[PDB]
Symmetry: C2
Subunit: 283 residues, 2 copies
Amino acid sequence: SVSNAREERMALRQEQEQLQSRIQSLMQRAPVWLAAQNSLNQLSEQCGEEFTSSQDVTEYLQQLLEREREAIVERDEVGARKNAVDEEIERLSQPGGSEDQRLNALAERFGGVLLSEIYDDVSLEDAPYFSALYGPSRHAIVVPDLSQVTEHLEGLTDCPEDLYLIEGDPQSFDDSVFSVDELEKAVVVKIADRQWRYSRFPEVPLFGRAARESRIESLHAEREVLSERFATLSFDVQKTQRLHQAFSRFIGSHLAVAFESDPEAEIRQLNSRRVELERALSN
Amino acid sequence: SVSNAREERMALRQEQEQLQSRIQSLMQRAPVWLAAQNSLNQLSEQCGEEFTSSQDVTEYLQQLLEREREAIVERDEVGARKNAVDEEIERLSQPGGSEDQRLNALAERFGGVLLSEIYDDVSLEDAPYFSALYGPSRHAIVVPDLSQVTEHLEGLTDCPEDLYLIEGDPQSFDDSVFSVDELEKAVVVKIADRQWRYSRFPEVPLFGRAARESRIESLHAEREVLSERFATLSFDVQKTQRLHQAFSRFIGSHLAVAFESDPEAEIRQLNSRRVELERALSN
Ligand SMILES: [N+]
Ligand SMILES: [N+]
């Protein structure tokens, strides 16, 4: 019967050579599973959440990446709009410049209103065109009687060499009328027989500083709201890309190892089992 | 007979007391008639003439005084005219100033002439009025086709905001026409319905720098001819007023005495006569 008793003994060593080498691997495993556990606590500490599983890690990260891309399009979109205003404003600001002061004085002299002020109200898209339109008549003074001037007309001496005057109701003024051919960024009026004026569209037109200055305020409001939202976004992004890179380090290095049962658990268990085997080889 | 012989003797002393005192006066006379003769030679030396008589002195002086007054009205009249030119010139010179250079460039661009040059020819009395007249159309460019511009019209960018153009023959240009009311040192055009322009007469009008610059030359010519004649006159006057005062000194002091027969002539004559008397009182 020697065969059952001898072969039986083999199988116990056979196993013990397995438990021995099996344990040895768990020992290489430990130090790495240590570093792995550190990184996992740390990264899981960076945000209030609990990672029981590796799938949790992948889930928190799907969300992390949307937070990121969305924040990057908004911060980019905002700053785009911000710069579109930094620019806008710049344009409406440079002033030409300079209308004559004397005119203000004469319009005050004769009861009545300036035209720079009557049409100070006009729109931004229209303002440049209408300035070219009235030719040198832009700074005309509007007075309904034209009687005050005729009297004080002789008196005036220092007035600008050409003075333009128009009889109308400043409160409800009735637009002029021209023989005109509109050209790109310019206008061509037939002022008379065989005579024509070409006036370019100005940057900073006489007419419409009031609707203009008014837009320029609205742009400052918006700009400061943008720079405020931009600040919040760009921080938000930096913080997110910082947790992005957080996950990568961990993913590339410690992710496989973690979510394993501690090595020591099986190392001590296998050991009491190998001691049990050795005792049976002893008995 | 004692009476004839004694009384006869008296009359000889009687006379000798006359010759004695008569001679004494001639002696006071001499030194003064000396100084008188010096001044007469001297003054008669100052100008090539001969004074045989006191009437000669009065005659040369009538002439001297006309030379003087006439020279003083001419020198005064000349300098009056000179200063009327120093002034004139000053006025035509101060330049306003300044017409746009770009215009020159554009008129060269389109075959054709400027209006500042078409009317550069006008008169001085008319120039200021016509400048006020054309309003801002003074610097218009005259071109007969108006075709070159329409093509290059779009291209133009930097041109002054208002550009004025007129189709005519620069060589034989046909004046514009306005609805105008002429005012003192100003003009009032009805440019349109319910619209009027007031342009003051300029000092230094755009039109007529060519008839102006041309007058200004003629004034420099004349001015230098005046300052030349003025120089000759004013010297001539100084020299004359110097001979005027020459005559006065002499007139006030030595004129009575001169034109007398030398004292010594009668002093020696009377003396041989008083010696003859004394010899008869002796005999
Ligand atoms: N328009
Ligand atoms: N005139």
